[PDB]
Design a protein around this ligand. Sequence first.
Ligand SMILES: *[C@@H]1O[C@H](CO)[C@@H](O[C@@H]2O[C@H](CO)[C@@H](O[C@@H]3O[C@H](CO[C@H]4O[C@H](CO)[C@@H](O)[C@H](O[C@H]5O[C@H](CO)[C@@H](O)[C@H](O)[C@@H]5O)[C@@H]4O)[C@@H](O)[C@H](O[C@H]4O[C@H](CO)[C@@H](O)[C@H](O)[C@@H]4O)[C@@H]3O)[C@H](O)[C@H]2NC(C)=O)[C@H](O)[C@H]1NC(C)=O
Ligand SMILES: *[C@@H]1O[C@H](CO)[C@@H](O[C@@H]2O[C@H](CO)[C@@H](O)[C@H](O)[C@H]2NC(C)=O)[C@H](O)[C@H]1NC(C)=O
Ligand SMILES: *[C@@H]1O[C@H](CO)[C@@H](O)[C@H](O)[C@H]1NC(C)=O
Ligand SMILES: *[C@@H]1O[C@H](CO)[C@@H](O)[C@H](O)[C@H]1NC(C)=O
Lengths: 105, 53, 132
Amino acid sequence: TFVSVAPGQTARITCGEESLGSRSVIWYQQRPGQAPSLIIYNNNDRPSGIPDRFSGSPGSTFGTTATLTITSVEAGDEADYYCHIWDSRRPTNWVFGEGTTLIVL
Amino acid sequence: RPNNNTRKSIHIGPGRAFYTTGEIIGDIRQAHCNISRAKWNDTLKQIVIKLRE
Amino acid sequence: QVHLQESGPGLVKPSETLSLTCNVSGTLVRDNYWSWIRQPLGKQPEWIGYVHDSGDTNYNPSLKSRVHLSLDKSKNLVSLRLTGVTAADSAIYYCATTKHGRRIYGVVAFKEWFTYFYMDVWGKGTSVTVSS
Ligand SMILES: *[C@@H]1O[C@H](CO)[C@@H](O[C@@H]2O[C@H](CO)[C@@H](O[C@@H]3O[C@H](CO[C@H]4O[C@H](CO)[C@@H](O)[C@H](O[C@H]5O[C@H](CO)[C@@H](O)[C@H](O)[C@@H]5O)[C@@H]4O)[C@@H](O)[C@H](O[C@H]4O[C@H](CO)[C@@H](O)[C@H](O)[C@@H]4O)[C@@H]3O)[C@H](O)[C@H]2NC(C)=O)[C@H](O)[C@H]1NC(C)=O
Ligand SMILES: *[C@@H]1O[C@H](CO)[C@@H](O[C@@H]2O[C@H](CO)[C@@H](O)[C@H](O)[C@H]2NC(C)=O)[C@H](O)[C@H]1NC(C)=O
Ligand SMILES: *[C@@H]1O[C@H](CO)[C@@H](O)[C@H](O)[C@H]1NC(C)=O
Ligand SMILES: *[C@@H]1O[C@H](CO)[C@@H](O)[C@H](O)[C@H]1NC(C)=O
């Protein structure tokens, strides 16, 4: 979908279907004209090089959706986000989830 | 018995019902039971001493 | 740091065999998992499969009978082969690293756990166009 948020505010991105089993959701950020990069693994863990401003909902509460929450969004954060799904009850997804476009005013 | 089974009712006939599991909520698993070590193999030695009589 | 560069013919005729070359620098190809990702224009990226020299290699069932992977230990490069290409394959290839992760939610025995894969270092990418 489309998300509009003022700079410096907190935005939320919802991706994927409702939770059915245990989740290990992988997130990516793809700038236009570039390639996606590692953002979130294990739904809250990040590699070295990026700050703690990126947060994700844990895959514990069943019957919900995985959510990406970004605090104090600035102008350079406007990029395509794609979610990847790993589930213990669903088969391994060989295609990424539907993208979500956020707009920074 | 970790499954978190739900509770569904199926109608049979006059004033009766047949209750089964409808779906499994969460992660599916198996039934298992722990038995701590250094408590069973030590106790198996206790049996064989009196069985050595 | 690990830097990856891809090369190819660019334009491929239909029903031809498409081959790619992925230059690997700064690391050994034997000690890491390798995978290829094909991304259509305006669509989400599509994953093909991950390959390793030890034989722990699985492929997409939709494209199992048409893809082939190989490793060049002497030249330190990764190559892919695809036969019976169609117009739906007009996309962008990518050569990226792959690291394995273990998710343990339950008993460590009884084969309940499932493993996952994530991509750490990505290549620049090369454009492949299929037309007559
Ligand atoms: C005896 O019988 C008992 C049962 O009666 C058996 O008990 C089982 O033991 C195994 C250990 O071998 C247990 O596996 C562990 O599972 C936990 C589960 O945590 C996850 O699920 C939680 C509930 O859904 C959730 O809250 C957790 O969330 C945390 O993590 C997320 C990120 O994923 C984060 O966002 C959250 O904020 C939380 O921080 C979590 O998702 C799992 O965490 C354990 O991991 C271990 O290993 C890793 C890697 O080494 C390590 O990093 C961890 O710290 C941890 O040490 C582990 O896999 C299983 O759950 C038990 N089952 C039951 C029913 O209790 C037992 O095996 C039998 N034998 C013996 C000898 O006891
Ligand atoms: C079990 O089989 C049924 C087929 O009868 C699957 O589909 C369900 O069918 C019932 C009856 O029409 C519906 O009420 C459910 O909504 C259907 N399920 C879904 C997900 O749409 C069902 O999915 C199978 N599995 C389970 C766990 O029930
Ligand atoms: C089991 O499922 C119910 C919902 O049907 C939920 O309220 C409860 O917290 C669950 N318990 C466990 C241990 O998963
Ligand atoms: C019994 O089990 C304990 C637990 O590991 C072990 O230390 C001990 O050596 C065992 N004894 C015998 C006789 O097997």
